[PDB]
Design a protein around this motif. Structure first.
Motif, mmCIF file in Angstrom:
data_model
loop_
_atom_site.group_PDB
_atom_site.id
_atom_site.type_symbol
_atom_site.label_atom_id
_atom_site.label_comp_id
_atom_site.label_asym_id
_atom_site.label_seq_id
_atom_site.Cartn_x
_atom_site.Cartn_y
_atom_site.Cartn_z
ATOM 1 N N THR E 99 5.847 7.182 1.296
ATOM 2 C CA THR E 99 4.954 6.768 0.210
ATOM 3 C C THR E 99 3.655 5.981 0.494
ATOM 4 O OG1 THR E 99 6.357 4.844 -0.188
ATOM 5 C CG2 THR E 99 6.818 6.843 -1.464
ATOM 6 N N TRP E 100 2.711 6.140 -0.441
ATOM 7 C CA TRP E 100 1.362 5.538 -0.464
ATOM 8 C C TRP E 100 1.205 4.146 0.129
ATOM 9 C CZ3 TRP E 100 -3.650 5.602 -0.577
ATOM 10 C CH2 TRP E 100 -4.383 6.602 -1.236
ATOM 11 N N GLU E 101 1.624 3.157 -0.652
ATOM 12 C CA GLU E 101 1.540 1.757 -0.284
ATOM 13 C C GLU E 101 2.231 1.435 1.030
ATOM 14 O OE1 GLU E 101 2.348 -0.586 -3.931
ATOM 15 O OE2 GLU E 101 2.417 1.403 -4.865
ATOM 16 N N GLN E 102 3.561 1.345 1.028
ATOM 17 C CA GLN E 102 4.288 1.043 2.257
ATOM 18 C C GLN E 102 3.592 1.731 3.437
ATOM 19 O OE1 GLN E 102 5.598 4.314 2.498
ATOM 20 N NE2 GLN E 102 7.717 4.117 3.199
ATOM 21 N N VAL E 103 3.098 2.947 3.217
ATOM 22 C CA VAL E 103 2.335 3.648 4.255
ATOM 23 C C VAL E 103 1.060 2.879 4.673
ATOM 24 C CG1 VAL E 103 0.756 5.592 4.633
ATOM 25 C CG2 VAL E 103 3.112 6.024 3.970
ATOM 26 N N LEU E 104 0.028 2.883 3.825
ATOM 27 C CA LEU E 104 -1.242 2.218 4.135
ATOM 28 C C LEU E 104 -0.990 0.840 4.739
ATOM 29 C CD1 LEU E 104 -3.429 2.940 0.999
ATOM 30 C CD2 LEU E 104 -1.925 4.486 2.208
ATOM 31 N N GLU E 105 0.022 0.142 4.232
ATOM 32 C CA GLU E 105 0.351 -1.176 4.762
ATOM 33 C C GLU E 105 0.818 -1.083 6.205
ATOM 34 O OE1 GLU E 105 4.313 -2.604 3.471
ATOM 35 O OE2 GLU E 105 4.661 -0.753 4.587
ATOM 36 N N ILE E 106 1.940 -0.396 6.451
ATOM 37 C CA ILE E 106 2.442 -0.273 7.818
ATOM 38 C C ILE E 106 1.241 0.061 8.708
ATOM 39 C CG2 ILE E 106 3.993 0.965 9.376
ATOM 40 C CD1 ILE E 106 5.987 1.198 7.333
ATOM 41 N N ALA E 107 0.308 0.850 8.163
ATOM 42 C CA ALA E 107 -0.928 1.193 8.866
ATOM 43 C C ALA E 107 -1.565 -0.136 9.238
ATOM 44 C CB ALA E 107 -1.862 1.982 7.952
ATOM 45 N N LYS E 108 -2.066 -0.842 8.233
ATOM 46 C CA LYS E 108 -2.682 -2.140 8.446
ATOM 47 C C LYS E 108 -1.994 -2.875 9.603
ATOM 48 C CE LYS E 108 -2.185 -2.531 3.415
ATOM 49 N NZ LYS E 108 -1.853 -3.513 2.347
ATOM 50 N N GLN E 109 -0.671 -3.009 9.510
ATOM 51 C CA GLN E 109 0.127 -3.722 10.513
ATOM 52 C C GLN E 109 -0.012 -3.220 11.951
ATOM 53 O OE1 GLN E 109 4.615 -3.878 10.236
ATOM 54 N NE2 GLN E 109 4.179 -6.022 9.762
ATOM 55 N N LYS E 110 0.265 -1.937 12.174
ATOM 56 C CA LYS E 110 0.164 -1.372 13.522
ATOM 57 C C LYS E 110 -1.283 -1.287 14.022
ATOM 58 C CE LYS E 110 1.550 2.667 16.203
ATOM 59 N NZ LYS E 110 1.933 4.095 16.057
ATOM 60 N N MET E 111 -2.225 -1.345 13.082
ATOM 61 C CA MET E 111 -3.669 -1.314 13.329
ATOM 62 C C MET E 111 -4.284 -1.741 14.660
ATOM 63 S SD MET E 111 -5.852 0.128 11.724
ATOM 64 C CE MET E 111 -7.320 -0.756 11.862
ATOM 65 N N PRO E 112 -3.596 -2.585 15.452
ATOM 66 C CA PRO E 112 -4.199 -2.968 16.726
ATOM 67 C C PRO E 112 -4.959 -1.862 17.475
ATOM 68 C CG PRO E 112 -2.338 -4.336 16.416
ATOM 69 C CD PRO E 112 -2.503 -3.524 15.121
ATOM 70 N N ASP E 113 -4.320 -1.226 18.457
ATOM 71 C CA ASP E 113 -4.968 -0.166 19.243
ATOM 72 C C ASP E 113 -5.416 0.975 18.335
ATOM 73 O OD1 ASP E 113 -5.648 0.868 21.965
ATOM 74 O OD2 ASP E 113 -4.203 2.434 21.479
ATOM 75 N N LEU E 114 -6.199 0.641 17.309
ATOM 76 C CA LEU E 114 -6.674 1.618 16.341
ATOM 77 C C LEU E 114 -8.174 1.849 16.321
ATOM 78 C CD1 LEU E 114 -8.019 1.859 13.372
ATOM 79 C CD2 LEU E 114 -6.414 3.585 14.193
ATOM 80 N N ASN E 115 -8.555 3.083 16.639
ATOM 81 C CA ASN E 115 -9.944 3.524 16.654
ATOM 82 C C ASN E 115 -10.711 2.896 15.503
ATOM 83 O OD1 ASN E 115 -8.708 5.207 14.507
ATOM 84 N ND2 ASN E 115 -8.032 6.463 16.236
ATOM 85 N N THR E 116 -11.851 2.283 15.797
ATOM 86 C CA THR E 116 -12.637 1.633 14.757
ATOM 87 C C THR E 116 -11.712 0.629 14.074
ATOM 88 O OG1 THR E 116 -13.644 3.811 14.388
ATOM 89 C CG2 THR E 116 -14.253 2.042 12.892
ATOM 90 N N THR E 117 -11.397 0.887 12.807
ATOM 91 C CA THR E 117 -10.519 0.059 11.971
ATOM 92 C C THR E 117 -10.991 0.231 10.523
ATOM 93 O OG1 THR E 117 -11.891 -1.773 12.791
ATOM 94 C CG2 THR E 117 -9.572 -1.747 13.475
ATOM 95 N N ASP E 118 -10.072 0.592 9.627
ATOM 96 C CA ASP E 118 -10.382 0.832 8.206
ATOM 97 C C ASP E 118 -9.052 0.977 7.452
ATOM 98 O OD1 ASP E 118 -13.362 1.296 7.713
ATOM 99 O OD2 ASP E 118 -12.536 2.603 6.168
ATOM 100 N N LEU E 119 -8.930 0.344 6.290
ATOM 101 C CA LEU E 119 -7.698 0.423 5.501
ATOM 102 C C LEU E 119 -7.308 1.885 5.234
ATOM 103 C CD1 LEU E 119 -9.132 -2.008 2.851
ATOM 104 C CD2 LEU E 119 -8.840 -2.308 5.305
#
Lengths: 180, 174, 136, 37, 138
Positions: E99-119
């Motif tokens: 799902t949407w939220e839990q998804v985008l969030e877990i995204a935010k969290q793992k975000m470290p080694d993440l190209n650029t960076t954007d919600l």
RNA sequence: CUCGAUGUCGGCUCGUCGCAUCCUGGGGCUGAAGAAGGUCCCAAGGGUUGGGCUGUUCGCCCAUUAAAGCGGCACGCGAGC
RNA sequence: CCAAGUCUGGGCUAAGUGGUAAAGGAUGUGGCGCCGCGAAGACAGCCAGGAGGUUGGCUUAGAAGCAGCCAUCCUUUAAAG
């Protein structure tokens, strides 16, 4: 739009020499009003080509008569392609014999569904609409699998509401690859 | 619009004789042939190839007399020597006058007779090649000596022109 | 092939043109300068498509095993009752409407045919819908 | 490799060369020497 | 014969010497199984149960290990998600859905080694690669 | 064409052309390292053994060989056995 | 060769097709229709990056295009494999 050249020398030897030059025979028809007029191909084709230019009229320029016409018949050339004779009708207010282009979407729920796929059966509708028919009547249904098919029933009608064809007889349906 | 542009630098003798466009420079009287309709100009600093049509024969021809005669030119400019590298653990090379030394396949007598513009540069001989005149036949003789015992795609050893990054296929099991 | 429960023994000899030209999916396979065509062969093309098609999106059809071929003898002499209904196939001569579906989208449907046909017995061609089609 | 028939290059870069009335396909991979003329 | 090259590896954080990915891979390709392995320990010590990725080499910074970087998209995807290996088939199976939220969030969290960076960027990456697996958006 | 006649098998003696060439040389290709192989292409040069069982041509076997080719001419040959 | 133009005119072949053959192969030759563009200055030549979650699937012993059956999203610009 469309434009042609009158057929003084008409009916036989003419149609032949016609093909020759690169002009194929044609009829301009309206209720009991007709003219053996003749087709310059190259463009005649481009035009027909639009196909939109085949389900929906265009304006004819003959001598100087910018008038309204579509095609009802065309002896298309047995031996390959290109036809042997084109037939058009010019209208007023009441166009019933309507073969309106019909587009649709089984809202992708078939292939990326059961591997299964979609067979377009009707594609167009010969219903009714007074020289006021959309060049794209359309329909949809995210159901694209199982022993699934859809028809004129469900159909889903536009501004010019008039089915001159039959009461549901399958617009089309989905059959499996090697099934699902 | 292009298949004809070539200058004639250095007071090189560039002129039309009996259907032969004579290109004399460092003693090399290179013959850049002349076809009936081709024809060119010898003006100020530029020599130009012209075309009496432009079908397959004439256009190709254009490219020809143009580039080949060009050859007559740069050639007469210097003198043409072909740069080649022999190199094989099982191989040797030394001039000895007018002769190809060479040996990469035992029973050594690989004695030659360099044609003309040719002479032998034994700089190593892991580095060693030919010198000529007319850019053309030097490439041919060069390839001559090259091939006579040369190849080895699976285990190198031969005579290598420049040496185009020579390819090679595996051995047995390893 | 198919052509179950006939009615008669064996037709005969003739050929000149026909009447199939439309389409049915836009995977257009059309004969050109033929005559008979072995049902078997037919399958040949059939299968060809069938497997090229990443195995699934099921093609259509066209013609049929149509008629009954007889070589009659076995190698013999001739004058027997010309018996034996050894072969079964179609009679398509003027580029006929051989049409079949999957969902290739492009030269893959192309290939599929190209092959199946190369396969068939004659100078023939293929295409897509260029002149819709009006029914009652 | 000879095959008085077919020859449709293959080896991605595989070349079709006219040569003395012969369709001789040449590649930089020995593996395709397509000779049919 | 010896062609140098930093070794990019995905391995069992918490452990250190996964037979196939660090025995052969590192040691012969251009690194070392068990040594790079104990350095691994040094790190993986607090990252090790949703799988861990690190590129290890003998490089500048004058040393051996290199860079530890967020456990690859799709994989950490199922990781937080709730399934073992791969959902055997993606798309034509439409059975693993998140799902949407839990998804985008877990995204935010793992975000470290993440190209650029954007919600939206990380979230979208989630929906997408997740799909790649069978971790489809629903 | 043949029945007011064209003596049909095998062998023998004598052969003569064909290549789709067995052996030969010339070849590119390799899943070729060497050696040797398999795979097409080029080309008739000459070369292309003895026995056994069978009226057999063919064939299977004994011993060879570089090889132990296929096939045309009424399945060449009774006005030559 | 034997009678009668080695006629004139405008093509098109160049293999000797003419002097039998197909299925079928192809930057053979000469004739016409759509798609990108040299001033969103072309193509081959050539420079230089050779993008980050891509290294998602059974099989991973290994798919992480450069095993095979399931994908075809995302980040993000030199652009987008």
């Amino acid at each position: 739009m469309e434009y042609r050249l009158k057929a003084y020398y008409r009916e036989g030897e003419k149609p032949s020499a016609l093909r020759r030059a690169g002009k194929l025979p044609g009829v301009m028809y309206n209720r009991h009003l007709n003219r053996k007029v003749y087709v310059d191909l190259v463009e005649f084709d481009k035009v027909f080509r639009q196909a939109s230019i085949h389900h929906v009229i265009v304006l004819e320029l003959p001598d100087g008569q910018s008038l309204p016409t579509l095609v009802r018949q065309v002896n298309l050339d047995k031996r390959r392609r290109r036809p042997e004779h084109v037939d058009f009708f010019v209208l007023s207010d009441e166009p019933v014999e309507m073969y309106v282009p019909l587009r649709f979407v089984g809202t992708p729920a078939g292939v990326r569904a059961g591997g299964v796929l979609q067979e377009i059966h009707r594609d167009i509708l010969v219903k009714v609409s007074p020289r006021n028919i959309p060049e794209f009547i359309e329909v949809d249904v995210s159901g694209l699998e199982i022993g699934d098919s859809l028809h004129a029933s469900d159909l889903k009608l536009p501004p010019g509401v008039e089915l001159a064809v039959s009461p549901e007889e399958t617009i089309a349906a989905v059959v499996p690859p090697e099934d699902v | 619009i292009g298949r004809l542009p070539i200058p004639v630098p250095k007071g090189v003798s560039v002129e039309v004789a009996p259907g032969r466009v004579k290109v004399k420079g460092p003693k090399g009287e290179l013959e850049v042939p002349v076809s009936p309709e081709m024809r060119v100009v010898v003006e100020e600093g530029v020599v130009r190839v012209e075309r009496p049509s432009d079908e397959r024969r004439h256009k190709s021809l254009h490219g020809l007399t143009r580039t080949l005669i060009a050859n007559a030119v740069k050639g007469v400019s210097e003198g043409y020597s072909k740069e080649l590298l022999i190199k094989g653990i099982g191989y040797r090379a030394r001039l000895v006058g007018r002769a190809l030394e060479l040996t990469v396949g035992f029973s050594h007598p690989v004695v030659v007779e360099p044609p003309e513009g040719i002479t032998f540069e034994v700089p190593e001989p892991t580095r060693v090649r030919v010198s000529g005149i007319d850019k053309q036949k030097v490439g041919q003789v060069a390839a001559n000596i090259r091939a006579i015992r040369k190849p080895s795609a699976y285990h190198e050893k031969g005579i290598y022109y420049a040496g185009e990054p020579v390819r090679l296929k595996p051995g047995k099991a390893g | 092939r198919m052509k179950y429960r006939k009615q008669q023994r064996g037709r005969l000899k003739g050929a000149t043109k026909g009447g199939d030209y439309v389409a049915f999916g836009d995977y257009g396979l059309v004969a050109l300068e033929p005559a008979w065509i072995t049902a078997q062969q037919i399958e040949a093309a059939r299968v060809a498509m069938v497997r090229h098609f990443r195995r699934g999106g099921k093609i259509f059809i066209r013609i049929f095993p149509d008629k009954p071929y007889t070589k009659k003898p076995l190698e013999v002499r001739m004058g027997k009752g010309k018996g034996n209904v050894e072969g079964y196939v179609a009679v398509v001569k003027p580029g006929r409407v051989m049409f079949e579906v999957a969902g290739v989208t492009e030269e893959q449907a192309m290939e599929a045919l190209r092959i199946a046909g190369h396969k068939l017995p004659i100078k023939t061609k293929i295409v897509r819908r260029d002149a819709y089609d009006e029914a009652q | 490799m000879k095959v008085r028939a077919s020859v449709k290059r293959i080896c991605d870069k595989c070349k079709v060369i006219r040569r003395h009335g012969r369709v001789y396909v040449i590649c930089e991979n020995p593996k395709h020497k397509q000779r049919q003329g | 014969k010896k062609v140098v090259a930093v070794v990019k590896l995905q391995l069992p954080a918490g452990k250190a010497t996964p037979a196939p990915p660090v025995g052969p891979a590192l040691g012969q390709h251009g690194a070392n199984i068990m040594e790079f392995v104990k350095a691994f320990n040094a790190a993986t010590a607090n990252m090790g149960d949703a799988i861990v990725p690190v590129e290890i080499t003998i490089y500048a910074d004058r040393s051996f290990t290199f860079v530890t970087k967020t456990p690859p998209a799709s994989y950490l995807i199922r990781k937080a998600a709730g399934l073992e290996k791969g959902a055997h088939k993606p798309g034509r199976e439409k059975v693993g859905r998140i799902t949407w939220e839990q998804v985008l969030e877990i995204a935010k969290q793992k975000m470290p080694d993440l190209n650029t960076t954007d919600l939206e960027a990380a979230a979208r990456m989630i929906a997408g690669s997740a799909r790649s697996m069978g971790v489809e958006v629903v």
